[PDB]
Amino acid sequence: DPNFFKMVEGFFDRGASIVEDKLVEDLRTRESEEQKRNRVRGILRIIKPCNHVLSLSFPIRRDDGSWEVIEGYRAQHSQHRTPCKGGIRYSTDVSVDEVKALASLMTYKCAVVDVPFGGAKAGVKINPKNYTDNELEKITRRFTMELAKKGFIGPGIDVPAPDMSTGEREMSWIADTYASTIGHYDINAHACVTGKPISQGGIHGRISATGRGVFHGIENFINEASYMSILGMTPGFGDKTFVVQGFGNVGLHSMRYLHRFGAKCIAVGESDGSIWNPDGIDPKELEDFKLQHGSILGFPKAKPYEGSILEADCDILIPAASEKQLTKSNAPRVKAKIIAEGANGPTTPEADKIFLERNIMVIPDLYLNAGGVTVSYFEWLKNLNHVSYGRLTFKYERDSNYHLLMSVQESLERKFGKHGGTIPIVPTAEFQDRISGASEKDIVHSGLAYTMERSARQIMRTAMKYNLGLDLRTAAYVNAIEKVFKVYNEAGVTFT
Amino acid sequence: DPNFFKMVEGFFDRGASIVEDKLVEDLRTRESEEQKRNRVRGILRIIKPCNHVLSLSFPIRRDDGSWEVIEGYRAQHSQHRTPCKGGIRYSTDVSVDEVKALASLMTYKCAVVDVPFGGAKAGVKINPKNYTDNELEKITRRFTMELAKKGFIGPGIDVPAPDMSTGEREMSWIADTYASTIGHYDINAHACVTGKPISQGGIHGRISATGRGVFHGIENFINEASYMSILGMTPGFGDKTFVVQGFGNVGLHSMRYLHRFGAKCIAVGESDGSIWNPDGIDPKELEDFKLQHGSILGFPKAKPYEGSILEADCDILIPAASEKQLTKSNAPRVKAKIIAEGANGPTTPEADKIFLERNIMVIPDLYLNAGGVTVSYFEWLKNLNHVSYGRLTFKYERDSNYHLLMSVQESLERKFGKHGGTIPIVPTAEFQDRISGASEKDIVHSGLAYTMERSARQIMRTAMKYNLGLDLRTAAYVNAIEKVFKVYNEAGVTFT
Amino acid sequence: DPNFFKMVEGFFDRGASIVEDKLVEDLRTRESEEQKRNRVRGILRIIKPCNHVLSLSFPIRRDDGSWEVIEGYRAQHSQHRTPCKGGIRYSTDVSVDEVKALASLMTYKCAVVDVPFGGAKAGVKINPKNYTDNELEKITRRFTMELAKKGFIGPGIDVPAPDMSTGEREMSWIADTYASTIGHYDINAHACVTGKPISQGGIHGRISATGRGVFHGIENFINEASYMSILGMTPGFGDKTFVVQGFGNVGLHSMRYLHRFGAKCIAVGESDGSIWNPDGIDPKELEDFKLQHGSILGFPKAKPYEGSILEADCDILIPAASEKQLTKSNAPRVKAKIIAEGANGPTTPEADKIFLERNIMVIPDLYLNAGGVTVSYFEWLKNLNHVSYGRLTFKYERDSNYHLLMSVQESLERKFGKHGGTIPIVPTAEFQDRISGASEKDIVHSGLAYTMERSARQIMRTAMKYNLGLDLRTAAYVNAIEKVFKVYNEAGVTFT
């Protein structure tokens, strides 16, 4: 198996090239001055390498009065779009190369869903398990101060975020330290990081963010005829059946919305055993089980399905867990026609070829799980705005809606000696709930849906542009590379 | 009678305690590590004391070439939420304790209506009457410079506002001085203060702001069954009758909207005599009278009601004037079942008990007159946005509304050989006015309504949460204390 | 006994008036336009009141996981001269009035010795004894952050310093916190406070600073004929005999230099008993004793002198301890002709009159112990310079000195068939030590001496200017008031 560094490096190169010819030709060779347009492709070579990478060593006084000196890293791949956005990982295996790689992905991931940020990513070579929360707060804050002093953390410079290793606690600590030290004068000091609790400037619609992204990503393609044709999908009996490997936030939430929209969750997966049931596993129940006690293991109404759920027969298989699960090994034995990468990097470059060869459509991690980045862009915006979405309009809207309905009523009653007989004024219960439950998550999820869709359409349009097939992944990176190149293109370097 | 310092100090303590137990238990004792959660209640002790208080002495050269050295104060209760928001009072009785007290109230008042600001408050020990406008401008600007230099006036630090003693002139002077000196480089320099004239960045819907707040506050409770049951309200004959003590902006405007919605204004009050009329005093008229000449005294269609209107028999009595009017003295002789505190602090802690005992529902100053703070939050926002609300959408909306209606028409005419026969396209006159008069105040008032309501529901939910009765006041402060504690809770102190 | 507030307030007023007439007349009434020069004395009224006073309340988490919320204050009397300079006191009795008062003194004290700073002073209502060093570091740093955020601690704004309650630890903590948070970008961040250890940017010659000040202060007057005439001093047998009440840094060091210059230390004092010996107590010994074990109590070669050393018969009595020791009570029974106030405020306003009446010359605290402020001005300077005094010149100088001597030699040998016979080249041992021990303290002490002297001469010149007698104290405050008035005078207020 390869390493993200090489995988992404490859993903990049592959598209960089595909892009090269087209990009130069019909696109800009129009005015082929000296035909040295092939030389102006120097943009791509500037684009590829993660621009700046900071490596720290800083101490914290462990609770037992002793001194430990922690080491961490933070790379900012591109500032072609201002606040570099990216997570912070606390794990003993984080490496400049890991960070260097992921930071790259992030710029491409952001471009795909049109999020105005450069990619960045951090790692503090630490094992949270080995530390008291007090020591964790100390590490995060000291880490922040350093990040802040060398230009790797401000609101308009770099805006970190959690990673499976970190969370809203760490995010709150960071925001706080920045806003009380280095960012004291900044009116948007609290925008220095996203992923914070609601009480500290967080945005509603955050947790489910990543899941809905998976949901909407799969949706946009699954309602696409052409795509579903090549797969023989949109079946009369096959219909909708999904197997979710991994039952965390994303896997959990994916199972929820996929289901809420008429999909049958036949089998769910974990780190221990698996589960099965052709009749359908209910999201809520399985959720409450996993909450009421440890794993989903022994879920009543669940036959302990044994074998890799990856092998399971279903239409859509969502690896919402562990890196590279789909490999050349099991790739040829998979039964699903759609591989929606809920997890970051669950299929190896080889497995891709196999799937490609046997027409298994794999919806790319780059696009599929970019829903979280999408909502973070919204938090940052929330932080800059200094107000929650819909705070000033919900009521205004409620009023106008009612006016529309009352106008239908009044106009219709003018076609009778009516005065209270035709009652449109009454909104559907569904609209009634919506009305009575107007809140941020609403606006947030709308934006998410709008981005996931507008982007799906873009990725599709490029597949064709670049005549790629069900090779959504390279269509994606290409879509991104084109975008990143464009910003530079309408500038340059220093003669930018 | 007590002093706000003690009153508010008390109000605070009372809730702080009620909150303590609950807050710790089911809420966070879940993970009672060392059960030293009772120690983490140190948050409350940090919360109580007004954080910083600045006291100045600065000179101005009185018009007669002489030098006077004015003294003033500004306290910032909490920065747990960034721009401390709060007024500036010019009166010879302003005191560090007064300011210290009011600044506290402000943080709680803001939390109640979910306005993201810490409480702050100022006082310049001066009597405006004794000074020429030129001297007032000099005092306000010099005051501002000082405030600015010690961190008590920036847009992202502290944003002052008027107080009965000060107004949009002073507000304009301030904004101006800050924006031309200390705030020269600030793109939001004009957000340093709210309450400014429209031509200087003010917001429309400001004046009536406080009145509508009173209106909506009373409304939310008056349409609440359960509440009105305990009072025997929502009467078949009693219905709606209010007596407004005090006829200033707030009292004026309260009388207007209460009335506009079917309430009978039986008697209005002033500093001189009073007025009466069981048949109903019209807001507009009484308004024009008070404008055309001095007091409402001798209002035609008004029998000079003599006695304290507080004693008057009506359903709702709104003290929109002088501090502590309802005391243990007259408390037991009041006839109203609802005491809507339009004024800040019109009922003493004792009178509260009496009312409580005899089921008179008193809607708290903390919540009831927070409508002004609400609109100031909107001004500040308008200032940051650099645009008036609805500037870019009114037309877009007008268009879509018309499309909705034209779609109803077209769809309905497809159920006939119709082509211009069924006319829904015609909006109700009411909707027609709304359409033709789209402007900021609209959006502003909507936001106000949305906040007053969402908060009323919150206050109600906590009353029950804490099993308080028609003790809306302590339910309020509790609601606030909970909020303020939460922000700290998801942070700390230094280990914040 | 009165309180510094009133005492200093008085000291101020007294001189303010003396100054008024003269200051206006021959000095500026030259061009008596409208003769409203008496109105331009508004300067004095602006001068008197401590300009700004900040009062905090901030928490620290006491070592036992609990939360305490500490309260402190910092007043800046005048910014007529930029960095307000002033100490920080940790004691449960610090009060806005105390701070307000002392901050005033500081501006006058600084003016006297021509130190370009406004007076400021702080107090953290805390008892160091009740806290662990870790808690003290927390309090000092948090205190600093607050001070920093409201404009009461930067290098070019306000530069705190120790007070008997605080010291170089606290000073280091402060400098450090400022330089790592709020002052991160400041190249002179470390100049935010004086009194720091040498390793953190401190200056050499600091500890003894206050003592030498006392020494030089007494000296300048004691070598003054006219003064010593009125006292019958500069005696043939009486000569030099001093009694030092209080044996701390200042009392210790005063005893040292007074002695080193031919003064007989007859009796030293403490908090317990006293000591006596007409033959002379040796500074070093008494020093080592007080170090080797507790108090000076039972000093071999010391008869436990019992009674107030204040009553002791000696020429010069230095109260280098406790506030107001010399009162109307014992004033008339004192035997010394010179009262050199090593301590801040050791004689009451009444006692002054008595001494005045009986020609006891009291050298004012304002001037006499300003030696420490003097050296702090030098630390701050050292901090701005980014180099130690004499670092670049000592060697250059050594060289030139040797050239001077070698030129004397060579020139003298040209008046003989000499070549190595006349040897001036040889510097006196004393000059040899000086040469071989060249270091900062040298330059520091020189500056101290130069200031103490140039100021003594100034104070003397004003005594006469204002025809004051051996009323050095009011001559001092007058000297200061004149200075402070001049800076404003060549500016104004806003029309400054």
Chain A residues with CB-CB distance to C181 below 8 A: 181-182
Determine the distance in angstroms separating the CA of C40 from the nearest CA of chain B, rounded to an integer: 7
Residue after which a domain boundary falls, among A200, A232, A258:
A200
CB B11 within 8 A of CB B5: no
Domain range for B484: 201-495
Please check whether residues A226 and A370 belong to one and the same domain.
yes
Burial of B464 (0-12, 13-18, 19+ CB in 10 A): exposed
CA B412 – CA B291 distance, rounded (Å): 53
Burial of A273 (0-12, 13-18, 19+ CB in 10 A): middle
A374 phi and psi angles, rounded to 5 deg: -50, -55
User: Sign of the CA dihedral B441, B446, B452, B455?
Assistant: negative
CA C393 – CA A314 distance, rounded (Å): 86
Please, which residues have CB within 8 angstroms of residue A302's CB and are 6 or more apart in sequence?
A: A275, A276, A277, A281, A286, A296
Q: Hey, what are A68's tokens?
A: 């430990």
CA C410 – CA C420 distance, rounded (Å): 9
CB B440 within 8 A of CB B203: yes
CA A398 – CA B60 distance, rounded (Å): 52
CA C376 – CA C370 distance, rounded (Å): 10
Question: Which candidate in A61, A133, A150, A181 is best for mutational testing of the C interface (most C CBs within 10 A)?
Answer: A181
CB atoms within 10 A of CB A359: 12
The answer to whether the CB atoms of C59 and B42 lie below 8 A apart is: yes
CA C408 – CA C402 distance, rounded (Å): 10
Q: Hey, what are A316's tokens?
A: 């859509």
**C398 in a labelled binding site:** no
Chain-centroid distance of CA B19 in Å reads 24
B324 phi and psi angles, rounded to 5 deg: 20, 80
Please check whether residues A69 and A44 belong to one and the same domain.
no
Judged by DSSP in three states, B265 sits in strand
Please check whether residues A83 and A154 belong to one and the same domain.
yes
Burial of A495 (0-12, 13-18, 19+ CB in 10 A): exposed
Residue after which a domain boundary falls, among B200, B221, B237:
B200
Residue in B6, B36, B100, B121 annotated catalytic: B121
Determine the distance in angstroms separating the CA of A393 from the nearest CA of chain B, rounded to an integer: 6
Q: Does A380 touch chain B (CB under 8 A)?
A: no
Look at residues A256, A264, A247 and name the one whose alpha carbon lies nearest to residue A283.
Answer: A256
Please check whether residues A60 and A98 belong to one and the same domain.
yes
CB contact burial C456-468 (16+ within 10 A = b; e otherwise)? bebbbebbebbeb
CB A267 within 8 A of CB A274: yes
Look at residues B483, B477, B365, B370 and name the one whose alpha carbon lies nearest to residue B80.
Answer: B483
Q: Give the Cα-Cα-Cα angle A357, A360, A363 (nearest 5 degrees).
A: 120
Upper half-sphere CA count for residue A107 (Cβ side, 13 Å): 33
CA A116 – CA A105 distance, rounded (Å): 14
User: From the annotation, which residues of B make up the binding site for ADP?
Assistant: 388, 454
Determine the distance in angstroms separating the CA of C44 from the nearest CA of chain B, rounded to an integer: 10
Please check whether residues B252 and B188 belong to one and the same domain.
no
Determine the distance in angstroms separating the CA of A418 from the nearest CA of chain B, rounded to an integer: 15
Please check whether residues C5 and C87 belong to one and the same domain.
no
Three-state SS annotation for chain A:
CCCHHHHHHHHHHHHHHHHHHHHHHHHHHHHCHHHCCCCCCHHHHHHCCCCEEEEEEEEEECCCCCEEEEEEEEEECCCCCCCEEEEEEECCCCCHHHHHHHHHHHHHHHHHCCCCCEEEEEEECCCHHHCCHHHHHHHHHHHHHHHHHCCCCCCCCEEEECCCCCCHHHHHHHHHHHHHCCCCCCCCHHHCCCCCCHHHCCCCCCCCHHHHHHHHHHHHHHCCHHHHHHHCCCCCCCCCEEEEECCCHHHHHHHHHHHHCCCEEEEEECCCCECECCCCCCHHHHHHHHHHCCCCCCCCCCECCCCCCCCCCCCEEEECCCCCCECCCCHHHCCCCEEECCCCCCECHHHHHHHHHCCCEEECHHHHCCHHHHHHHHHHHHHHHCCCCCCCCHHHHHHHHHHHHHHHHHHHHCCCCCCCCCCCCCCCHHHHHHHHCCCHHHHHHHHHHHHHHHHHHHHHHHHHHCCCCCCHHHHHHHHHHHHHHHHHHCCCCCCC
Q: Does B449 touch chain A (CB under 8 A)?
A: yes
CA B115 – CA B113 distance, rounded (Å): 6
Name chain B's partners: 3 or more CB pairs within 8 A: A, C
Our answer to whether residue B121 is catalytic in this structure is yes
Judged by DSSP in three states, B46 sits in helix
Chain-centroid distance of CA A463 in Å reads 21
Chain B residues with CB-CB distance to A399 below 8 A: 434, 446
Please check whether residues A191 and A210 belong to one and the same domain.
no
User: Sign of the CA dihedral A144, A146, A151, A152?
Assistant: negative
Three-state SS annotation for chain C:
CCCHHHHHHHHHHHHHHHHHHHHHHHHHHHHCHHHCCCCCCHHHHHHCCCCEEEEEEEEEECCCCCEEEEEEEEEECCCCCCCEEEEEEECCCCCHHHHHHHHHHHHHHHHHCCCCCEEEEEEECCCHHHCCHHHHHHHHHHHHHHHHHCCCCCCCCEEEECCCCCCHHHHHHHHHHHHHCCCCCCCCHHHCCCCCCHHHCCCCCCCCHHHHHHHHHHHHHHCCHHHHHHHCCCCCCCCCEEEEECCCHHHHHHHHHHHHCCCEEEEEECCCCECECCCCCCHHHHHHHHHHCCCCCCCCCCECCCCCCCCCCCCEEEECCCCCCECCCCHHHCCCCEEECCCCCCECHHHHHHHHHCCCEEECHHHHCCHHHHHHHHHHHHHHHCCCCCCCCHHHHHHHHHHHHHHHHHHHHCCCCCCCCCCCCCCCHHHHHHHHCCCHHHHHHHHHHHHHHHHHHHHHHHHHHCCCCCCHHHHHHHHHHHHHHHHHHCCCCCCC
Largest CA distance in chain A: 88
CA B196 – CA B174 distance, rounded (Å): 9
Question: Which candidate in A403, A425, A431 is best for mutational testing of the B interface (most B CBs within 10 A)?
Answer: A403
Look up residue B303 and give its DSSP letter. Answer: B
CA C314 – CA C334 distance, rounded (Å): 9
Q: Does A399 touch chain B (CB under 8 A)?
A: yes
User: What CATH number does residue B61 fall under?
Assistant: 3.40.50.10860
Determine the distance in angstroms separating the CA of C6 from the nearest CA of chain B, rounded to an integer: 18
Please check whether residues B185 and B210 belong to one and the same domain.
no
CA C163 – CA C152 distance, rounded (Å): 17
CA C61 – CA C69 distance, rounded (Å): 8
Calculate Rg over the CA atoms of chain B: 25
CA C280 – CA B394 distance, rounded (Å): 96
Q: Hey, what are B158's tokens?
A: 């502290």
Which value in Å is the resolution of this experimental model? Answer: 2.7
Q: Does A434 touch chain C (CB under 8 A)?
A: no
Judged by DSSP in three states, B206 sits in coil
Question: Which residue is listed with tokens 């794990």?
Answer: A91
CB atoms within 10 A of CB B310: 23
Judged by DSSP in three states, B276 sits in strand
Please, which residues have CB within 8 angstroms of residue B414's CB and are 6 or more apart in sequence?
A: none
CB B121 within 8 A of CB B95: no
Name chain A's partners: 3 or more CB pairs within 8 A: B, C
CB atoms within 10 A of CB A460: 18
CB C475 within 8 A of CB C459: yes
Chain B residues with CB-CB distance to A199 below 8 A: 486-487, 489-490
The answer to whether the CB atoms of B447 and A173 lie below 8 A apart is: no
Ramachandran area for residue C294 (φ above 0: left; ψ -120 to 50: alpha; else beta): left
Determine the distance in angstroms separating the CA of B4 from the nearest CA of chain C, rounded to an integer: 20
CB C228 within 8 A of CB C222: yes
Q: Which helix (H) or strand (E) holds B217?
A: helix B209-222
CB contact burial A309-346 (16+ within 10 A = b; e otherwise)? bbebebbbbbbbbeebbbeeeebeebebbbbbbbbbbb
The answer to whether the CB atoms of C182 and A180 lie below 8 A apart is: no
Q: Which residues pair with C119 in a beta bridge?
A: C85
The answer to whether the CB atoms of C149 and A182 lie below 8 A apart is: no
The answer to whether the CB atoms of B57 and C68 lie below 8 A apart is: no
CB atoms within 10 A of CB A139: 24
Calculate Rg over the CA atoms of chain A: 25
CB C267 within 8 A of CB C303: no
Q: Give the Cα-Cα-Cα angle A344, A349, A354 (nearest 5 degrees).
A: 115
Active site residues of A: 121
Three-state SS annotation for B50-107:
CCEEEEEEEEEECCCCCEEEEEEEEEECCCCCCCEECCEEECCCCCHHHHHHHHHHHH
Q: Which helix (H) or strand (E) holds B249?
A: helix B249-260
CB C72 within 8 A of CB C124: yes
CA B372 – CA B214 distance, rounded (Å): 10
Residue after which a domain boundary falls, among A200, A235, A256:
A200
Q: Hey, what are B455's tokens?
A: 């908060």
Look up residue B182 and give its DSSP letter. Answer: T
Interface A–C counts its CB contacts (< 8 A) at: 9
* Number of domains composing chain A: 3
Chain-centroid distance of CA C17 in Å reads 26
Neighbour order of strands in the sheet with A264-268: A264-268, A241-245, A316-319, A338-340, A361-363
**Whole-Å CA distances, A495 to A45, A107, A399:** 16, 23, 53
CA A315 – CA A330 distance, rounded (Å): 17
Contacts of B28-35 with CB under 8 Å at 24 or more apart are B28/B489, B34/C65
User: What CATH number does residue C3 fall under?
Assistant: 1.10.287.140
Residues in chain A: 496
User: Sign of the CA dihedral C143, C147, C148, C154?
Assistant: negative
Q: Which helix (H) or strand (E) holds B245?
A: strand B241-245
B118 phi and psi angles, rounded to 5 deg: -90, 160
Number of H helices, E strands in chain B: 16, 11
**Whole-Å CA distances, C366 to C50, C102, C214, C240, C369:** 17, 11, 11, 24, 7
CA C147 – CA B54 distance, rounded (Å): 12
- Cβ under 8 Å to A: C residues 180-199: 180-182, 184
CA C147 – CA C158 distance, rounded (Å): 9
Chain B residues with CB-CB distance to C140 below 8 A: none
CB C459 within 8 A of CB C439: no
Burial of B349 (0-12, 13-18, 19+ CB in 10 A): middle
Of B82, B188, B446, the CB nearest to A392: B446
Question: Which residue is listed with tokens 């592959």?
Answer: A14
CB B472 within 8 A of CB B363: yes
Q: Hey, what are C450's tokens?
A: 């130069």
Q: How was this structure determined?
A: X-ray
Look at residues A287, A291, A331 and name the one whose alpha carbon lies nearest to residue A308.
Answer: A331
CA A469 – CA A473 distance, rounded (Å): 10
CA C78 – CA C485 distance, rounded (Å): 11
Residue in C6, C22, C100, C121 annotated catalytic: C121
CA A117 – CA A120 distance, rounded (Å): 9
Q: Hey, what are B373's tokens?
A: 């703070």
User: Sign of the CA dihedral B399, B403, B409, B413?
Assistant: positive
Question: Which candidate in A404, A415, A442 is best for mutational testing of the B interface (most B CBs within 10 A)?
Answer: A404
Q: Which residues pair with C57 in a beta bridge?
A: C71
The answer to whether the CB atoms of A182 and C184 lie below 8 A apart is: yes
Q: Which residue of C has its CA nearest to A181?
A: C181
Please, which residues have CB within 8 angstroms of residue B289's CB and are 6 or more apart in sequence?
A: B296, B299, B300
CB A444 within 8 A of CB A389: yes
Please check whether residues C343 and C209 belong to one and the same domain.
yes
CA B135 – CA B59 distance, rounded (Å): 11
Chain B residues with CB-CB distance to A411 below 8 A: 405, 408, 422-426
Judged by DSSP in three states, B274 sits in strand
Look at residues B442, B377, B371, B388 and name the one whose alpha carbon lies nearest to residue B201.
Answer: B388
Look at residues B203, B397, B212, B433 and name the one whose alpha carbon lies nearest to residue A396.
Answer: B397
The answer to whether the CB atoms of B150 and C152 lie below 8 A apart is: yes
Of B34, B50, B54, the CB nearest to C57: B50
Determine the distance in angstroms separating the CA of B462 from the nearest CA of chain C, rounded to an integer: 27
User: From the annotation, which residues of B make up the binding site for GTP?
Assistant: 204, 208, 257, 260
Q: Strand C264-268 to strand A52-61: parallel, antiparallel, or no bridges (unpaired)?
A: unpaired
Please check whether residues A304 and A242 belong to one and the same domain.
yes
CA B372 – CA B389 distance, rounded (Å): 18
Please check whether residues C192 and C230 belong to one and the same domain.
no
Q: Which residue of A has its CA nearest to B439?
A: A396
CB atoms within 10 A of CB B133: 9
Judged by DSSP in three states, B32 sits in coil
Please check whether residues C14 and C125 belong to one and the same domain.
no
**Helix segments in B119-184, DSSP class H:** 133-149, 168-180
Q: Hey, what are A345's tokens?
A: 């990097």
Largest CA distance in chain C: 88
Look at residues B313, B337, B328 and name the one whose alpha carbon lies nearest to residue B264.
Answer: B313
Q: Hey, what are C399's tokens?
A: 């060289």
Ramachandran area for residue B280 (φ above 0: left; ψ -120 to 50: alpha; else beta): left
